[PDB]
Amino acid sequence: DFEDRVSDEEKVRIAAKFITHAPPGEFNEVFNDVRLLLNNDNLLREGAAHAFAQYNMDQFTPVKIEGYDDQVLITEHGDLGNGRFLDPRNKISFKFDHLRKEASDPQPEDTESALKQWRDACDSALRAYVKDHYPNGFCTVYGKSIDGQQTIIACIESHQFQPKNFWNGRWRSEWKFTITPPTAQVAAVLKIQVHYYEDGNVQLVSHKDIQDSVQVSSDVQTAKEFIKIIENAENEYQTAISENYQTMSDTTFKALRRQLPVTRTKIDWNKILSY
Amino acid sequence: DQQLDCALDLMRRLPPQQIEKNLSDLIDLVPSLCEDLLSSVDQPLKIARDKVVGKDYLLCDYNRDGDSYRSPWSNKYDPPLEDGAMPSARLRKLEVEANNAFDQYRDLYFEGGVSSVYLWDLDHGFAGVILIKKAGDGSKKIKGCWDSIHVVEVQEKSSGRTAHYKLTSTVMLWLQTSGTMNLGGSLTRQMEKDETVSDSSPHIANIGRLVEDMENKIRSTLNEIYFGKTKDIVNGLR
Amino acid sequence: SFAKPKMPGRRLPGRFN
């Protein structure tokens, strides 16, 4: 009934939910579909703008900044408001266009110098770790006072996009600890997404929470310990995923359907129809 | 215009884990596409009980009329319907035979699960859907499910000694568990062929052979894509 | 590719109809 019709507010909510669920490397195609389906660019711009930003922060989208060598991750931790984000490695702020995925207008950004040495020490250890362990990985390390507590937040991204082969994948990990000697709780989340869509639509989605402990001493030593914890946990996770793959393949998949009947030949279809 | 195109493309990208919810929200977004979307977007199969014969049967758009679905065993709709889409008398006889053949097929290859076959008349032939659903037993802390949807079209010829078969087949394969891990979705393949129609090679044997060939092929491609390619992609991320 | 066979015009689900 008309009283219970789907409202334009509900339609742009649906549009925004669809964009936020775009696979890695496929934002543009999902956006274009949703745009043509809504058929109302003004409703889309006002009602789904936050979803552009939500997707990029959720995906740890890497972005090149003109003039600066390494890329920075778009995360919730770098959101400075007014469509600007923080690059804490270069200590700059920059405008980010969430649709074109383009950075502009870099300006120096003030840095609370209480975490400068610790953020720099963790960043340098983590950068070496990421280049060693990932094919084209990127990472961003933040330093903030959260609830009066000095915290280090490390974010890692690694994707492989091959749309011409109809697949895309992305790895994201996020690691946190407070600078609280002698022992700090480590909290982490690891995420994998893979999309394959040649004559089909197959997706892997995985998510693991991690709790560990790190010994806090000097900035350089803690950084070393922190990276050791990351390496061990990310190595173990990758192992466990491939072990889950093996069990799915030789236990669950095989139990779902035989390769052939016990006759070890295909079916005699006239014996099937016989009385 | 391009809306139906965009909607189908969009369903090839949204997580298959939420197919049912995303399709309903998609139709709300563009209601004029409801009929084409319900007949074009494959959805996980649902099980219903035919209380008259005491047998399970499978639900999909092809046995739906309004909010009612038709049982292949009793040929009645549930909830009851007085004006429901029905196969012609002659095609229904063939539908009964097809259900019994593919129930045996199901037992031979899946050793359990549920099957259903629904046929409908066409101007110069007929069409059918062959459905199989088999849930994993949950062993080793892994939940699985297999959904087969085979849609066949039969174009009959003047000689009655040859017909043209067109097969569109989808298998939906769903797996989920350290932490959480969910590997799911589907693959679709097509093929078309002429076959001899004879007293010794009737329609159901021709269809049966095409479905078996296709599903054996898709089982092997699922093995390759799910446990080969997507694992390889994961390992190439790190 | 090619199109799947289409079915007779049937009543839509009560929600969208």
Coordinates of C-alpha atoms in Angstrom, one line a residue, chain B residues 65-229:
Chain B
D65 CA 2.9 -18.2 -8.2
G66 CA 2.2 -15.1 -6.0
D67 CA 3.2 -16.1 -2.5
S68 CA 2.4 -19.8 -3.1
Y69 CA 4.8 -22.6 -4.3
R70 CA 3.9 -25.8 -6.2
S71 CA 4.8 -29.3 -5.0
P72 CA 6.3 -31.6 -7.7
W73 CA 4.8 -34.6 -5.7
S74 CA 1.2 -33.6 -5.3
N75 CA 1.0 -30.8 -8.0
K76 CA -0.7 -28.5 -5.5
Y77 CA 0.2 -25.1 -4.3
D78 CA 0.9 -24.1 -0.7
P79 CA -0.7 -21.9 0.5
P80 CA -3.7 -23.1 -1.6
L81 CA -4.3 -21.3 -4.9
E82 CA -7.3 -21.6 -7.2
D83 CA -5.6 -19.9 -10.1
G84 CA -2.1 -21.3 -10.1
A85 CA 0.3 -21.9 -13.0
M86 CA 0.2 -25.5 -14.1
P87 CA 2.0 -27.8 -16.6
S88 CA -0.2 -29.2 -19.3
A89 CA -1.6 -32.7 -18.6
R90 CA 1.0 -34.3 -20.9
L91 CA 3.9 -32.3 -19.6
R92 CA 2.9 -33.1 -16.0
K93 CA 3.3 -36.8 -16.8
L94 CA 6.8 -36.1 -18.0
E95 CA 7.4 -34.0 -14.9
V96 CA 6.5 -36.9 -12.7
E97 CA 8.9 -39.1 -14.5
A98 CA 11.6 -36.5 -14.4
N99 CA 11.2 -36.1 -10.6
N100 CA 11.6 -39.9 -10.1
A101 CA 14.7 -40.0 -12.4
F102 CA 16.4 -37.1 -10.7
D103 CA 15.6 -38.4 -7.3
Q104 CA 17.6 -41.5 -8.2
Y105 CA 20.3 -39.3 -9.7
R106 CA 20.4 -37.4 -6.4
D107 CA 20.8 -40.5 -4.4
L108 CA 23.5 -41.8 -6.7
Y109 CA 25.7 -38.7 -6.5
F110 CA 24.7 -36.9 -3.3
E111 CA 23.7 -39.9 -1.1
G112 CA 21.1 -37.7 0.6
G113 CA 19.8 -34.2 0.2
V114 CA 16.6 -33.2 -1.6
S115 CA 15.7 -32.8 -5.3
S116 CA 12.8 -31.3 -7.3
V117 CA 12.0 -30.9 -11.0
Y118 CA 9.5 -28.4 -12.4
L119 CA 8.6 -28.3 -16.1
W120 CA 6.6 -25.7 -18.1
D121 CA 5.2 -25.5 -21.6
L122 CA 6.6 -23.5 -24.4
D123 CA 5.2 -22.8 -27.8
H124 CA 7.5 -25.2 -29.7
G125 CA 8.9 -27.3 -26.8
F126 CA 9.2 -27.1 -23.1
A127 CA 11.5 -26.0 -20.3
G128 CA 12.4 -27.3 -16.9
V129 CA 14.4 -26.6 -13.7
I130 CA 16.3 -29.4 -11.9
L131 CA 17.0 -28.5 -8.3
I132 CA 19.3 -30.3 -5.8
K133 CA 20.1 -29.2 -2.2
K134 CA 22.5 -31.1 0.1
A135 CA 23.7 -29.7 3.4
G136 CA 27.0 -30.7 4.9
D137 CA 26.9 -32.7 8.2
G138 CA 28.9 -30.0 10.0
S139 CA 31.9 -32.3 10.6
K140 CA 35.3 -30.8 11.6
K141 CA 33.6 -27.5 12.7
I142 CA 32.8 -26.6 9.1
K143 CA 29.3 -25.8 7.8
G144 CA 28.6 -26.5 4.1
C145 CA 25.8 -26.5 1.6
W146 CA 25.5 -27.3 -2.1
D147 CA 22.7 -25.9 -4.3
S148 CA 22.2 -27.0 -7.9
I149 CA 20.0 -25.1 -10.2
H150 CA 19.8 -26.5 -13.8
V151 CA 17.6 -24.7 -16.2
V152 CA 17.0 -26.5 -19.5
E153 CA 15.1 -25.4 -22.6
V154 CA 14.0 -28.0 -25.2
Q155 CA 13.2 -26.7 -28.7
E156 CA 11.4 -29.6 -30.6
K157 CA 11.8 -30.1 -34.3
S158 CA 9.6 -31.2 -37.2
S159 CA 11.1 -34.7 -37.4
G160 CA 10.5 -35.5 -33.8
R161 CA 13.8 -37.4 -34.2
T162 CA 16.0 -34.4 -33.0
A163 CA 15.6 -31.6 -30.6
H164 CA 17.9 -28.7 -29.5
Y165 CA 18.8 -28.5 -25.8
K166 CA 20.0 -25.3 -24.1
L167 CA 21.3 -25.7 -20.5
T168 CA 22.1 -22.9 -18.0
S169 CA 23.5 -24.4 -14.8
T170 CA 24.5 -22.8 -11.5
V171 CA 26.0 -24.5 -8.4
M172 CA 26.0 -22.4 -5.3
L173 CA 28.6 -23.7 -2.8
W174 CA 28.7 -22.4 0.7
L175 CA 31.4 -23.0 3.3
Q176 CA 32.2 -21.5 6.6
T177 CA 34.1 -22.2 9.8
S178 CA 41.0 -19.4 13.0
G179 CA 38.3 -16.7 13.8
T180 CA 35.6 -16.5 11.2
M181 CA 36.1 -17.7 7.6
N182 CA 33.3 -17.7 5.0
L183 CA 33.9 -19.0 1.4
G184 CA 30.7 -18.9 -0.6
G185 CA 29.1 -18.0 -3.9
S186 CA 28.3 -19.7 -7.2
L187 CA 29.5 -20.5 -10.7
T188 CA 27.3 -20.5 -13.8
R189 CA 28.0 -22.4 -17.1
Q190 CA 26.0 -22.7 -20.3
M191 CA 26.0 -25.2 -23.2
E192 CA 23.6 -26.1 -26.0
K193 CA 23.5 -29.2 -28.2
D194 CA 21.4 -31.1 -30.7
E195 CA 20.5 -34.6 -29.5
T196 CA 18.6 -37.5 -31.1
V197 CA 15.2 -38.0 -29.6
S198 CA 14.3 -41.7 -30.0
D199 CA 12.3 -44.5 -28.2
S200 CA 15.7 -45.5 -26.8
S201 CA 16.9 -41.9 -26.1
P202 CA 13.9 -39.9 -24.8
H203 CA 13.9 -36.3 -23.6
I204 CA 14.6 -37.3 -20.0
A205 CA 17.6 -39.4 -20.8
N206 CA 18.9 -36.5 -23.0
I207 CA 18.4 -34.0 -20.3
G208 CA 19.8 -36.3 -17.6
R209 CA 23.0 -36.8 -19.6
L210 CA 23.4 -33.1 -20.2
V211 CA 22.9 -32.3 -16.5
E212 CA 25.2 -35.0 -15.3
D213 CA 27.9 -33.9 -17.8
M214 CA 27.4 -30.3 -16.7
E215 CA 27.4 -30.9 -13.0
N216 CA 30.4 -33.2 -13.1
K217 CA 32.2 -30.4 -14.9
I218 CA 31.1 -27.7 -12.4
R219 CA 32.0 -29.9 -9.4
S220 CA 35.6 -29.9 -10.9
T221 CA 35.6 -26.2 -11.6
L222 CA 34.3 -25.4 -8.1
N223 CA 37.3 -27.4 -6.8
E224 CA 39.6 -25.4 -9.0
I225 CA 38.2 -22.0 -8.3
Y226 CA 37.3 -22.3 -4.6
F227 CA 40.3 -24.3 -3.3
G228 CA 42.8 -23.5 -5.9
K229 CA 42.4 -20.0 -7.3

